[model samples]
Target: YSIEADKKFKYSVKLSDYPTLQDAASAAVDGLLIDRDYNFYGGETVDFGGKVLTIECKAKFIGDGNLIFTKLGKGSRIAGVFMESTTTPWVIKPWTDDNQWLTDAAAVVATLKQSKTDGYQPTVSDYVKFPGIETLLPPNAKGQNITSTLEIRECIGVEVHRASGLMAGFLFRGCHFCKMVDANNPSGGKDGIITFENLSGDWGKGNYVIGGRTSYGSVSSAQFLRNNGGFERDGGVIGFTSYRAGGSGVKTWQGTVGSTTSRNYNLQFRDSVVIYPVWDGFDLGADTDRPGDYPITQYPLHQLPLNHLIDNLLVRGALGVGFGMDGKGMYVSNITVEDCAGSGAYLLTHESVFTNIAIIDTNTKDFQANQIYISGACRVNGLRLIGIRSLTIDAPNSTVSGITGMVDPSRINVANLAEEGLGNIRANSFGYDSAAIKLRIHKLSKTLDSGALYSHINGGAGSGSAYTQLTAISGSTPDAVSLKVNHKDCRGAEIPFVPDIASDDFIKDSSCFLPYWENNSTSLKALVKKPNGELVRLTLATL
Candidate 1:
C-alpha cells in the first residue's frame, strides 16, 4: 500500500530538539513530495486488517546476514523513497544595483591592496577613437568636469596656428608679443608664416616700428626733403628686396617722400621719420623715366649739413634733394659727408650751423664737383674739406661768416663781393688786403787827420794869404813841416806840409812832384803782380 506523503520525517525520540537538521531535512524532502502529505506519531496498532501482529520488544535479527539492515521503526514507512538530490543546477537572478556592487568591490580591493596604479588611465590608442566617440556625444552636452585643473607644465617644440583676416594678415597684439612669419629658404622649401601688429594706445611717441614690405613690380615716384633746404625730386621708389639679417631677423623699408610742386617741402624729419609713396622701400626722390626708378641726379649733399656741428655724423650712402626756388631757407646743421658723390652740403640760404663737419670728395666725374657751397647769410665753424676740388663760399647779398678749414690750397672762388660790402678788399692767398701807400729813408758820416796828408809844400811859400794859411799848421811844427831845401843852401827855408791835394791842382800839375796824388803816396797804391808771381808797386813813390 502507498503511504501518504509527508514533508517532515524524523527517526529520533530522546535527542535534544535540533531544528536546523529538521528544517534542512524538510527542505530537502519538500523538493521530492510534489503532491504528497504525511503524519507521524502514536499509531493505532493492528485490528484494521484481520491479521495477527507480532511486536518484538527486544533486539533480534530479522534478516539474513547478507541482507543485514540498520534499523526499523513502528512509524510511517516512506515506501518508494523518491529522495531529492541536493547537488542540482540552480540560477540566481542578477541584482538590481550591480554597478554599485562593482564599485564597492573595486574600492574594497583597492583598500586591501596598499596603493593604486595607473590602471584606469586612457592612452593614445584610446584617444585614436576620439573622433568616433565625439560624433556620438550630444551637440550641446557638456563634457565631464575635471576635478583638477591641468596646467601646461612644459612645452616641447609646440606650435600654434591662428586664423587671420585678409587685411590683417596675422596680428599679435599683447604684452611681450612675438611672431615669426614666412621666411624664404635658399633650398626652396616651404617656410612658415609670421606676423606682428600693434594694439597699444601708446602709438605716437617712442614706438619701435620694424618689419619689411615687398612689392612684385614697380613703385611710385616722389620728392624727398634734405637737411639743407630744397626738395629732392624723383625720390621714393622700390625696385629690389631689402633685408636685415642676424640680430632680431627683420627686414624693413625705410622711405620718404615730399610734394612735387613745393620747393622747400620736407618728406621726412628727424627722429627716424619715414614718408614714402610706396610701402616697400625708402624713396628719397623721384625718377622721371621709370615709375619707381629714382633718378641719380638731383641728389642732395652726400653728408648732412649739420655734421660739422655734431661729431661722428657720417653719411655712408647717397642723398637726394629737389631744386629750391627763391625765398627759401636751406640750412643744415652738424653732419659728416664721406664717400659720397654729390655735394657735401648745399645751402641756398646762410641761416644754418655747420660745425665739425668733414666733407670728402673722392668722385672722378666733373658733374660731382664742389663739395660744399653756401649762399646767403650762413655761418660755419670748424668745417673741413678733404680730396675735394672746390668749396665755394658765395654770398651775393647775404652776410656769411664761418671758419672753414680746408686742405691746403683748396679751390675757393668767392664771388659777388661788391654788393656784399667787400669791394675794396684785395683777395690774396691769405685773406682780404686793405692798404694804400709805401715809404723809404737814409743817412751818412766820416773823420780825417794830418797823417793822411799827401804833399810837402804849398806851391813855393806863398807871401800872402796862401802863405799864412800854409804856415799856420794845425798840429805839426813849422820846421818839421818845411819842404826839402837844397844841400848847398841849407837854411831855415819853410816847407809847409800839405793836406790831401786837390783834384784840379793834381790834374794841372803834371810834373809838380808826382803826376797824381796816388803816385805821390805808396800807402794808397795797390800792389801789382810781376810775371814771375812776385809783388811790385806801380806808384812812382814805391819805384
Candidate 2:
C-alpha cells in the first residue's frame, strides 16, 4: 500500500493562541494490534531494529576521555571533544637520535679529549707576562772615569798605620780619598800596614797635595806645618815625589824658609792614630841636587839627614797631635802645638808677624825633643805662654824671643845669641806659681863694640831675700861686671850702669874703647849712653 501525502502539516503557534489544548481526539484509532510475524522474538541476537538503534546512540564526551563526538542541529551544535584511555602510552628521546648519531658522538668525544690533554690552555685574556722595568744597567759601574767636583763639607777622620814592606800598603791619592781598614781584622796576615801615602806626583800639575796658590805657590799645608814647628821636614816625606809633568813652581816653600805672610795655610792632625813609617816618617821636599833649584842650604837645617835616618817616629797611642804653620811674608804670625806627642808635632820654615804658641803636657815627656823650638831668623811680634811644662828657645840665628810671663829656666831654658826686635826682657810672673831664671838679654849680632850688654830682672825667684843678678859684660872685660852691685835683692827696679867712675872708670880709657884691628877702626863707642841717662862706656866683652 502507498501512503497519501498530507499538505497541511506546517503550523505556527504563538503564546497568545495556545490558551487550551485537548488530549483526546474523536477521529484517532483506539484499537492496537501486535504483529507476531513467524514469531515476534526479542532475543539478544535478534533484538528489534529500533531498540538496537536506541542502544547504539552515542553521548558526547569533552576534555580527556575514552570516546568523543560532536552533534549538529539548527539551534545548537558541539564544536570538538577529547578522549583518554589505558590503550595510549608516552615515550621520550634526544634530538640527536638520528642516522648520523655515531659520527656526531665521535666528534663530541674527540673535542672533550683535546680539551683535557691541552692542560688548561688559557686565552690571552686570562693571563699575562712582563719583562719588568729595570732590565738594563750600565757596564762601567766601577766609577773610574768620574771627574765630578766634590766639595769637602766635613772630615770624618784621618789615620796613618805603619807596616813593614817595600811598597806602602795603600795610599790615598788625594785628600778627598781615604784609606780605611778594619782595625779589628787586618788583611794579608801582616802585623803592620801603611794606610796613607802622599800622592802628590800622581795628581799631575796644578793638582798639589796642599798648596796656597795655583801658580808660583807652595803647598798650603806644607807652609802651615813648617812655620808652626820650624823650617824642617816632618817625620813623613812630602813634595819628594815627582809630578808626571814638570812645572815652574816647587812643591815646597824654598825662597824664604821661615814663616811668611803671603799665604795662610794650616796642617792639623787630631784624634787619629799615626803609626810611624819604618824608614822615613815624612819628608817635606826632595833631596838637594847642586845643579837643580832645590839646594842643601835651602833644605831644613833642623831635620837630621843622617843619624836618625827617618824624619820623625810617631809611635802607637799618639793622639791629638796638632802642629800649625802660618805667617805673612817676613812675619812669623802664629805657631801653636798642644796636647800632642813630641815626635808627632813638627814645624818648619816661617818668618815675620807674631809667633805665639805653646806645648802643654800633663804627663811624662816620653821622648827627649824640644817641645817648642823657633829657629832660622824668626821675628816674633807677640808671645804668650800658659801651662807649658817644657823648654822654649830661640835658637842661634833666630831673630827674636819675647815672653808674656816669667821664663822658668828649670822647666824652660832660653839660650843662644838670638836678637829680639821689641818687647820686654824680665822674670815678671803674669800668673801665679811661676818662676824664671837666667833671664838675660844681649846683642843679636856678635859685636860687643855695640856697648855693654843691658839686662833686666823684675820678679825674683824667692821672697824679699831673693838674690837677683844684673851684670853688664864689657868688650875689654871678659868676666861679668856686677851692674846691680849691692842691689841683689832689688825687685821691680831698673838698674842703670854708670860706666866711668867705679863702673865708668873703664869708659874714659882709650885702650878700653879702642877698636880691634879686624874692625878697620870702626868703633861703636858712640852707642854706649844708656837710654836711662846713665854714664856711657865702651868695652870689649865676650858673652
Task: Note each model's CA RMSD in angstroms.
Answer: 49.6, 49.9
Q: Of the candidates shown, which would achieve the greatest TM-score relative to the real structure?
A: 2
Who wins the lDDT comparison?
2
TM-score of each: 0.24, 0.29
How many angstroms is residue 326 displaced in model 2 relative to the true structure, after the best TM-score fit?
13
Off by over 4 Å in 1: 1-313, 317-331, 362-364, 387-410, 414-543
Per-residue lDDT, model 1, residue 308, is 16
Cα lDDT tens digits, model 2, 211-264, are 111110001111111121123222322222111000111122223323221111
Which ten residues in a row are the worst by lDDT in model 2? 211-220
What lDDT would each prediction earn against the true structure? Answer: 0.24, 0.25
Residues forming the 10-long window of minimal summed lDDT in candidate 1: 184-193
Off by over 4 Å in 2: 1-335, 339-354, 361-366, 380-394, 404-406, 409-543
Per-residue lDDT tens digits for candidate 1, residues 425-472, read 442222212111111110110111122212223333431212211212
